[PDB]
Write a protein that binds this ligand. Structure first.
Ligand SMILES: Nc1ncnc2c1ncn2[C@@H]1O[C@H](COP(=O)(O)OP(=O)(O)OP(=O)(O)O)[C@@H](O)[C@H]1O
Ligand SMILES: Nc1ncnc2c1ncn2[C@@H]1O[C@H](COP(=O)(O)OP(=O)(O)OP(=O)(O)O)[C@@H](O)[C@H]1O
Lengths: 507, 507
């Protein structure tokens, strides 16, 4: 009973752990996912693989739940954590044949995790905020498995210039709002960096100007038209010449309503609903930008950038509820028509537009930008950049072997197993090649046996061995520490189960 | 797992790739397609075969989706692209037996594609816009598998004279609107080239003239009859002698309404709906062409050709909303009756009418005209006409073999395989014959081993070997480059799959 239900839980986890094994290197194979209706999709990363997966077995759920909590942190060390956890489980499964029972292995892993975390903090350097040439290599190496055939130089010079705006001034809080729009076009690969406001909404009546200098943005909500809500106090009619007079008065009231806004100092009108065609001419004889259908996601970016308040009615508008803009234009680019408002006041956030050919290419960039800025915000606030490319694990493996010699007991085999399991990263990063096999792992192991030589690792774009800091691979340390912590926490939630029962009571 | 799900994806693609293998040469067999209701159709091309096909397998869908995106470009290199992709897959399947795993083959294909594209741009010539005898051979060779028993001389002298109208003047933008009507007749094969407007609508009252000199076309929409819409403001009646007087006035108003149009300068009436029989006599005493039921597809060709606007009402017609025509006639040709308007003003587009015997012959021409003009618009704008008939692949195969000798490694076998796979076109073009077998491929291979001799290829109308530019085969280069690009892009979406999973979540 103790050994029957224990091996099944490990076998059920090793199947889902080795699924994202091939989707780890920069030049790895993708995954084709089909559905019952007939939706064939292609996924190259490993985050989407863990979501759309048959979680019918209880063992194939806790690991995914743990990985989802770690992916929402930095979003980079998700697949490697699952690979390390699977390697640890496979290494610990063989150690159960000596009849020692799972207990000392957990203590050994807990003792080795602290040593690894202490050693990782001593193999890094100090990166200040006055650098610039160092902050671009991390952005260049962040886009490898997504699509290096078009994103390797153009997408590495516009992210650093866009993020470095409020992070260098305040190195603590830099929570921005970055929105990526999924739209196609006709070009190969075009990247636009809008330094203003982007509105994704067209019109139907092209009878309004689209070039106003130093215009002012005025945010107006509802309660503007004649009928939009309801009225509890009902009214009555007496003479037929009174209703027509009231209608004419309510129609002419719009003239003075627009004149008041013009005299207050505003030339841009942003309404939540739609603007009637009869209210356009009144906005054309005075030079006021007419717009309609403003999404809340696009409207919330106007109060913190231009500087204006909202009006719940129509008679609550004065002079302090106005903003300031630069140039509002409506160009037809990439098929659809979008509104560009340039020169605001406080350039906090930024907008990035990607134009490709079909429809699956732009989406491929949608999962690449969010994973490219996340490695930047954790760089200025920290600065413990280590040597990426599978060099930290090999360096820690040579230290754990000599550190485990100072202790006596059955806990040394656990530390040795944890140290040997760290060599799975170079075996997976070199499996995608044909001229690597196993000689690369033997050559990179005896190279770090001297005094120095630490930045050397492995690159799949050459074949030989060289330094990683001189090429352009500078993976941070947080993405490794969080991955190691997740792997050490997930490997203990399965060995401490042993038996499994069932019940008919909810919760 | 890695080799089990990989071979099945290739075997599922090789079945659908070799289906359109026989439908490639000019004298190949057709395909009989049946349905569940009992619809037996015959298809000779390969574009329709990819559409009406059981796409129940996930592997037999991505290739069709890629081919559909390439067919909408020039519409000529669709079947050959699928054949090349299937040949590449079959050649790469055998290379997986040496335990190399798919990675270096993709790099070899990517390196060979650029070399092939660079070599294709150096084996062409320069074709200017002052030529005329060269622009007819491409149109003559464009109709081979459709029906060369009646289309080889008559259909090769009316396409060049119809396209060469606005392309020679502006060699950049030549987007026209060509419409092919599917109508039968009684003759063997008749081709009419209307240099005006063609309306496919008859009448019921043959009481109007059909021969007016220098008539003017006036476009009038609805809002003409007494009742066609609705009225919100209801009316009442007081005396019985008032409703009859109003009806008589509204009936007599048509007289002055037609008199105003006659005095404005118009003799042709084109209405969207139908014209009542009582409104015909008023159009007969003044010499005005009466017509009814005008389709939007036939009405949109009147504003850009004759030069006239539309009227949403009836009282908005003056003098500037009129056009100009030449001769409007209604002849009964090929059974049905059609309206011919000759001598317009701006002959932008053109109309082609095909008359056959039964009903499946004319449709056979319907899939031949669209594939005959598409190879012309890409000729004047480009001009890199190469030697067609399966001569570019044999020429590039002799160059790739000597180009792959300058590199060392496992990538040479991929380039050699890609070069050997290009010899499938001459084997498929010679399989339809009996006296070809394999000696033709051996004879055409050692012929290009000297200095010159490049225009020589293969013709199925003789048996021996000779030049292709002197016969009448001048296939352009764009249809080959796009096909090679599609074949290189489709062969990489299957080898990078390896494993395949499933899920129960939508999208
Ligand atoms: N040129 C390179 N040389 C060495 N290693 C590289 C190189 N490029 C990328 N890598 C490695 O690839 C890893 C990233 O792989 P990829 O972006 O394909 O998926 P991932 O981001 O690891 O997926 P997940 O975020 O789900 O873990 C990095 O950890 C990095 O060490
Ligand atoms: N007289 C000829 N000599 C040599 N080759 C010819 C001759 N006539 C046609 N061909 C070849 O036949 C091919 C066209 O075949 P066909 O028109 O039957 O189908 P297709 O247009 O290739 O179909 P798809 O457009 O789906 O690819 C051309 O690529 C051309 O090279």
């Amino acid at each position: 009973m103790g050994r029957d239900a224990q091996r099944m839980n490990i076998l059920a986890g090793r199947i889902i752990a080795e699924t994202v094994r091939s989707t780890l290197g920069p030049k790895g194979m993708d995954k084709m996912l089909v559905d019952d209706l007939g939706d064939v999709v292609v996924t190259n990363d490993g985050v989407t693989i863990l979501r759309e997966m048959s979680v019918e077995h209880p063992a194939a759920k806790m690991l995914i739940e743990v990985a989802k909590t770690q992916e929402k942190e930095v979003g980079d060390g998700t697949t490697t954590a699952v690979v390390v956890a699977g390697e640890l489980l496979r290494k610990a499964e063989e150690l159960l044949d000596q009849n020692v029972h799972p207990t000392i292995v957990v203590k050994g892993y807990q003792a080795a995790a602290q040593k690894a975390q202490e050693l990782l903090k001593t193999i890094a350097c100090e990166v200040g905020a006055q650098d610039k040439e160092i902050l671009t290599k991390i952005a260049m190496t962040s886009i490898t498995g997504k699509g290096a055939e078009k994103a390797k130089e153009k997408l590495a010079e516009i992210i650093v210039e866009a993020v470095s705006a409020v992070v260098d001034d305040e190195g603590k809080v830099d929570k921005d709002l970055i929105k990526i729009e999924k739209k196609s076009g006709a070009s190969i690969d075009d990247t636009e960096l809008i330094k203003g406001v982007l509105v994704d909404k067209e019109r139907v009546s092209a009878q309004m100007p689209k070039k106003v200098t130093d215009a002012k943005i005025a945010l107006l909500n509802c309660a503007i038209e004649i009928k939009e809500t309801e009225t509890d106090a009902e009214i009555r009619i007496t003479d037929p010449a009174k209703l027509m007079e009231f209608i004419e008065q309510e129609e002419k009231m719009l003239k003075d309503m627009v004149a008041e806004i013009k005299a207050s100092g505003a030339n841009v009108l942003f309404c939540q609903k739609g603007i009637d065609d009869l209210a356009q001419h009144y906005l054309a004889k005075e030079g006021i930008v007419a717009a309609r259908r403003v999404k809340k996601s696009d409207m919330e970016k106007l109060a913190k950038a231009t500087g204006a308040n909202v009006i719940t009615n129509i008679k609550d508008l004065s002079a302090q509820d106005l903003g300031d803009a630069g140039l509002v234009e409506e160009r037809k680019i990439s098929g659809d028509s979008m509104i560009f408002v340039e020169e605001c006041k406080h350039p906090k956030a930024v907008t990035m537009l990607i134009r490709g050919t079909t429809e699956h290419v732009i989406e491929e960039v949608a999962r690449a930008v969010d994973d490219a800025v996340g490695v930047v915000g954790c760089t200025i606030e920290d600065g413990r950049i280590v040597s990426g490319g599978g060099s930290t694990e090999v360096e820690l493996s040579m230290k754990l072997r000599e550190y485990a010699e100072g202790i006596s007991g059955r806990e040394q085999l656990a530390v040795r197993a944890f140290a040997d399991a760290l060599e799975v990263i170079p075996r997976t990063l070199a499996e995608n090649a044909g001229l690597d096999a196993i000689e690369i792992l033997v050559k990179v192991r005896a190279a770090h046996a001297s005094n120095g030589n630490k930045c050397a690792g492995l690159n799949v774009f050459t074949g030989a061995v060289e330094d990683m800091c001189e090429n352009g691979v500078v993976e941070p340390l947080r993405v490794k520490t969080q991955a190691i912590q997740s792997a050490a926490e997930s490997t203990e939630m399965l060995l401490r189960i042993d038996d499994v029962i069932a019940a008919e009571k909810l919760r």
